[PDB]
Amino acid sequence: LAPIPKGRVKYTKRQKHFAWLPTHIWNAKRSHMMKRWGYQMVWAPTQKCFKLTHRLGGDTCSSDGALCMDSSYIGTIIVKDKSNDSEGDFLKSIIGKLTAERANLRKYRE
Amino acid sequence: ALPQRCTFAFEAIDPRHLAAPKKLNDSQRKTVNSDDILSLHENYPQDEINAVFNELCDPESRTQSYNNQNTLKEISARRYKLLTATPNSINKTTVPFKESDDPSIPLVI
Amino acid sequence: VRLKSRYILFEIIFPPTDTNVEESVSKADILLSHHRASPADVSIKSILQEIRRSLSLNLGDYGSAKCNSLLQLKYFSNKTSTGIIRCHREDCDLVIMALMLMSKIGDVDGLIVNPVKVSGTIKKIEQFAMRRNSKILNIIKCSQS
Amino acid sequence: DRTQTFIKDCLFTKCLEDPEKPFNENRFQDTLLLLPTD
Amino acid sequence: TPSDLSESGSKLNVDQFISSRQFEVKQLQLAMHNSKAASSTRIFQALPRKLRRRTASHNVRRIPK
Amino acid sequence: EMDNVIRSLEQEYRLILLLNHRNKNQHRAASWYGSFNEMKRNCGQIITLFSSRRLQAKRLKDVEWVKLHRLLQRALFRQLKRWYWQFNGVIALGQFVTLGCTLVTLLANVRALYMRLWEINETEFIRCGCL
Amino acid sequence: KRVTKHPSLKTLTHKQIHTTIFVKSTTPYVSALKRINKFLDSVHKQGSSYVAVLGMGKAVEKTLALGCHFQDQKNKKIEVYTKTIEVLDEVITEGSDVEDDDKETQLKKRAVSGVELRIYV
RNA sequence: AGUCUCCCACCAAUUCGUAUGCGGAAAACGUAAUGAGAUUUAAAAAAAUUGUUUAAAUCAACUCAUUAAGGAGGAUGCCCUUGGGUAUUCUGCUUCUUGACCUGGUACCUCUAUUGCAGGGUACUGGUGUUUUCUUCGGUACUGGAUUCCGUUUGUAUGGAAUCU
RNA sequence: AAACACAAA
Ligand SMILES: [Mg+2]
Ligand SMILES: [Mg+2]
Ligand SMILES: [Mg+2]
Secondary structure: OOOOOOOOHHHHHHHOOOEOOOOHHHHHHHEEEEEOOOEEEEEEEOOOOHHHHHHHHOOOOOOOOOOOOOOOOOOOOOOOOOOOOOOOHHHHHHHHHHOOOOOOOHHHHO | OOOOOOOOEEEEOOHHHOOOOOOOOOOOOOOOOHHHHHHHOOOOOHHHHHHHHHHHHOHHHHHHOOOOOOOHHHHHHHHHHOOOOOOOOOOOOOOOOOOOOOOOEEEEO | OOOOEEEEEEEEEOOOOOOOOOOOOOHHHHHHHHOOOOOOOOOHHHHHHHHHHHHHHHOOOHHHHHHOOOOEEEEEEOOOOEEEEEEEOOOHHHHHHHHHOOOOOOOOOOOEEEEEEEEOOHHHHHHHHHHHHHHHHHHHHHHOO | OHHHHHHHHHHHHHHOOOOOOHHHHOOOOOEEEEOOOO | OOEEEOOOOEEEEHHHHHHHOOHHHHHHHHHHOOOOOOOOOOOOOOOOOOOOOOOOOOOOOOOOO | OOHHHHHHHHHHHHHHHHHHHHHHHHOOOOHHHHHHHHHHHHHHHHHHHHHHHHHHOOOOOOOHHHHHHHHHOOOOOOOOHHHHHHHHHHHHOOOOOHHHHHHHHHHHHHHHHHHHHHHHHHHHHHHHOOO | OOEEEOOOOOOOOOOOOOOEEEOOOOOOHHHHHHHHHHHHHHHHHHOOOOEEEEEEHHHHHHHHHHHHHHHHOOOOOEEEEEEEEEEEEEEEOOOOOOOOOOOOEEEEEEEEEEEEEEEOO
8 A cells, every 4th residue: 555645744744644636735725625535535616516517517518618627536556467478367357356247348358 | 429439648748838728720620520530430549558558557657757847947947048049030938848858748538 | 774676667558449430450450559659748747646646545644655655756758658666565566556546647538557567676677678669569560561 | 187087087988887986986096005014 | 207205105196197198098999999999888898706806905914823 | 219218118117016016915816916917027028128238338239139029029919908908807897996097007108118119129120130 | 239329520619509509309399489589689799690590300390390480470581401410320230248338339320411590680 | 794814826935945732725713731810910901893892709701821743662540450451741763855035255167259357057165244125026827709821741740920809 | 785995984
């Protein structure tokens, strides 16, 4: 498990439980903050955007704009087969066990 | 309208390099038919995509990307000295890219 | 704090009371025969005095005293016979009933008063008046054919 | 100041909708104080 | 002198400041709008509330004790 | 012919800096303050270069002519419209118009000096190495 | 055979999208009238002249009905144009037991006739 | 509701580079342990707010003064008496971006197209040096929409400029 | 009316 990075001692000392996004200060100055799952993510901006998100990001046609989400809290694992530098017959079964064999199919591989 | 398979990866410039978000060339906007979307499923540079993915996965190239990370003062001085260039006919508010003293950043879409 | 106002839009309609003459039955024909014009002897102080007399004559003394606190005619022109009467949100029913019980002008007879729109601001009243004026032109253009 | 006030009014009638609003409610200061706050 | 020195600091009078610079403002308005300079209506509209901000204080800051 | 324009420009820059020193904390986060601070940068960058006209005491320049040709076409036909639109929008609000009209007048008087410098320097611009 | 249909390519820059109503097969009549009136009132603030009304397939009939309404109701000049629309459809080609959605997707073109209806002010 | 404060561009840094009881982006912001205080006081009596507007037997309430984060050893108190858990106190390590500002001297490199000299940068030493403007003064950034012209495998795979609202 | 200000009171 990789630990928290080395940014600013002052701000690094604050968290001590929940990691900070690389845009924590900006979002905190723009949107609201909260700490639930060992992390600090955004809840909602100050200005109300109920109907704005519908007309911008939704399935609507009249959408002239864009929405940006800081989704760096989503953690990821990179897995590689080192039993050999060739086709991953082990990773095939690993994925077929981890998720349904929907994942382990010809489409998502090819 | 686009199909399911759409993954574009390449090496981009640091966004601090640009002064203003200049829009791309918009001249063939009218000549956009379904033949281009049909050919997009056929034409695909898998080699460069895999190269960028391996660069982003490997922790050596990912750290080499942090080789020469210029500061805002560096970019400010470069933009101030781009005022006096050899072509004295066109005003350029940007700074050209360098293959030696500049970081190549891998990105995935 | 805010003073709760409620403007009243009324129209003066002249019924074509003439039994000796035959008339055309249609939409725009009767709209034109009912919106012909207002007579020259028509102003703001002549309508305000008439409505003040009718209010005292129908309601009484206290009914006129409670209603005449903020009873004013803000905008009225005799070319289109459209007026905006300001009153309280409490006495709107009183002013409406008085405009309904309007019998006649002291010198001009044979006319009715129709309250159309009641709102608590002048901007929506103006918007509704513009919409009604635009609607009026449609049947006119259609019948001019 | 009269022709100056006319120029200011012809300038405010482009930005604002009621030109004689600030001069009536006294929002056009004739003096601009320039001093570090003490 | 558009600005002078006085009791507290320097005072800048808007009156003479825009009086001396009037033909320049006329030329600027002619360069911005050509046919609309003869007309007198509302060209600039109200600032959106989204871009609207709030005013801070005139002091620097208060240090923690 | 030049000294008068230089004195006018440095007299305008002094008032710009003096009112900026006071309006720095009053209106910190403002859209018009961005354009106001952007104007002072170009003003000072032209003022230091044309004060270098007296810093050297020679024939005027050799390459600062090219520098001026680069620095003149960034606020005349590039950032004049947005500056004027914002300087009028800060007045259209109605909260702060007293300094807004002065800022509009500042822009109107500063652009005239830039146009004068351009129309004066046309001849050696087309004469020396470009245009 | 399982086959899905995606929408048609729409390339509108900034203002072609604003003064244009795309009439769906499930779009009500009165809501379409309201949106058309709003577009007609907002056009000269957008800076255009006409309002585009685009419909294809089942909604063509009620799009022509919307046009015929404002034809004589408000006495506004209308223009009817007949265009072709190409749509891309993902089909499954035969080539163990996998999901129906996660199969071999091949793109196929299909041309359909549609009506564009412009209304003046 | 209120003549209170603050966010609503950034800056490996003349830009409060502030690891300072805890939480917090900041806040004339919340709260925790101890000691003291009453025009005889650090300060309340003869910036905002509030009709009365903290206390002045004890309690309760206001103000100010100290307590930097984590790991290891010993002692004491409790359930428990292999042992383990919690609280307090003393020694003491780990937490490391060659930075108050500014002046002078020396050493090296570049431009102004030979040199002494003129300006900038870096490495080192010495010093309170009139930093009495004890309240804002640094750097970069065209953020509405439409269309047209030109160059391109010789170089950059995209750049330059123009008209109207 | 509301909302704004190193105003004014
Ligand atoms: Mg209120
Ligand atoms: Mg109030
Ligand atoms: Mg309030």
